[PDB]
Every structure is written in C-alpha cells, then in structure tokens.
Amino acid sequence: CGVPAIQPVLIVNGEEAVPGSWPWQVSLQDKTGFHFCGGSLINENWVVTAAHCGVTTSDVVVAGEFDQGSSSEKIQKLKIAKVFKNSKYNSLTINNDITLLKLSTAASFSQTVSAVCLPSASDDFAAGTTCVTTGWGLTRYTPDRLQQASLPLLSNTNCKKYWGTKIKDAMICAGASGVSSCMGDSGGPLVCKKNGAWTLVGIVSWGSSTCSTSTPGVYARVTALVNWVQQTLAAN
Numbered sequence: 539c540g541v542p543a544i545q546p547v548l549i550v551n552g553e554e555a556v557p558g559s560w561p562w563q564v565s566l567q568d569k570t571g572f573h574f575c576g577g578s579l580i581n582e583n584w585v586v587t588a589a590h591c592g593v594t595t596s597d598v599v600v601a602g603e604f605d606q607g608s609s610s611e612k613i614q615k616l617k618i619a620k621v622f623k624n625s626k627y628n629s630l631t632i633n634n635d636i637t638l639l640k641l642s643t644a645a646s647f648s649q650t651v652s653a654v655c656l657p658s659a660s661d662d663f664a665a666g667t668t669c670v671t672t673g674w675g676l677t678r679y680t681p682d683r684l685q686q687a688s689l690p691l692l693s694n695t696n697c698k699k700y701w702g703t704k705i706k707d708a709m710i711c712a713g714a715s716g717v718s719s720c721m722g723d724s725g726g727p728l729v730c731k732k733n734g735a736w737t738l739v740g741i742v743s744w745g746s747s748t749c750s751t752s753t754p755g756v757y758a759r760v761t762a763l764v765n766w767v768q769q770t771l772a773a774n
Contacts, residue, residue, distance in 0.1 A: 549671065549718070549773045551677075561650055562579040575722070580642055583645075589624060606680075617639045622770055671689060675720040677720070679748050
C-alpha cells in the first residue's frame with residue numbers, strides 16, 4: 539500500500555495532479571453522474587469516505603479517473619454493496635466522520651488503481667509536518683481534473699484558537715497556509731509520507747463556509763478511527 543506506480547510531482551489554490559499519481563483516490567457520483575464526494579481505496583473491496591457524504595447503494599464509486607470531462611479514460615465504475623456508517627458518528631458535531639463502503643464488485647488494481655496505507659492507532663504525525671490532500675472539490679468559492687495541494691498539520695490545541703470547542707479528539711486540522719479543501723473534496727484523503735509510503739492520516743470533513751485559505755480545514759483523524767475500520771473489515 540501507499541506506493542503509487544506513477545510517482546506524484548509536488549481545493550482552493552491547489553494544482554493539477556499528475557494523471558494517475560494518486561491511485562487510491564476515487565470519486566463518489568450519484569446516478570446522474572454528478573460528483574459529490576471523494577474517497578480512498580484501502581484494498582480491492584473497500585472504500586473509506588466521510589459519513590456526512592450520505593452515500594447510498596444507488597451511488598457509484600469511480601476509480602482510475604483523472605479528467606471527469608474525458609470519455610477516453612479507462613475508468614472503473616464500481617457498485618456499492620453495503621454502507622457502514624460508524625455508529626459513533628455524531629451528525630451534530632460532525633465527530634467521527636467516517637463511513638466504509640463495501641463494493642459489490644472488486645476493483646481491479648493496476649498502475650492507476652491501488653490502495654493507500656492505514657496508520658497504526660499509536661502512529662504520531664507532528665504539527666508542522668507537510669502532507670497532501672487531493673480531490674475534485676471547488677477551486678474557487680467543480681474542476682474536471684484532479685487537484686492536489688501540500689499543507690501543514692496543526693495541533694488540536696492551536697486549532698482551537700480558530701474553531702474553539704468545535705474541535706474534538708477524533709479530528710485533526712491542517713491548512714491555514716494559503717490553500718483549502720472545499721465543497722466536493724469531502725470524504726477524500728489527507729495523506730502524509732511515513733517511512734516511504736503514503737499513509738491516510740485524515741478524511742476531508744469540514745471547515746470554513748467560504749473555504750478561506752487563512753483558516754484551517756478539519757479532517758477526521760484516522761488514528762482514532764482505524765480500530766473501528768479493522769473490526770469492520772474483519773467481521774464482513
């Protein structure tokens with residue numbers, strides 16, 4: 539996991555990514571083909587996304603896509619068998635914002651489709667560390683081509699200076715650096731390189747209503763949720 543066959547070369551104020559360089563990135567589209575959320579492949583049969591994305595079994599998971607306006611890309615449209623919304627998810631506070639999607643049809647891994655790594659519950663990602671987030675969300679307050687942006691992680695204590703008590707333990711902040719995740723990026727990945735491999739540290743969750751690049755974005759903290767992910771995959 540976490541090692542793209544096509545190496546990446548380094549959302550408001552982001553940049554266009556190298557085609558296929560973020561192989562675990564998927565697009566969640568409704569039956570009309572409308573992109574509404576991002577997601578990350580963790581293996582051939584499961585996708586991790588945000589619980590607030592409100593995915594249903596009528597929605598479709600699209601893997602291997604780069605330019606949503608192109609008809610010549612060999613993409614994979616995968617049906618969803620079951621939606622596992624974390625029972626700890628609190629829609630009022632948006633805490634524990636994670637949902638697992640069990641695919642009815644397994645994804646076919648290739649040079650452009652593969653899995654991201656999950657961290658250990660005890661893994662530490664220090665404030666100041668520069669990570670990357672990707673998605674097809676608005677670039678100005680959606681773009682056809684996949685965007686990317688590097689941004690720093692903040693500590694929860696420092697994040698509270700911005701969001702106060704809205705910041706919970708199962709959340710992690712990043713940004714306030716000139717870039718920002720925005721509507722349509724939700725459910726997508728916030729990855730950091732650890733020991734040579736890209737690890738899923740956060741899931742785009744919420745933030746500034748205007749996608750302000752001076753305010754930090756809030757992501758679901760994967761280290762606080764990985765135990766649930768492990769339990770779910772094991773029992774299903």
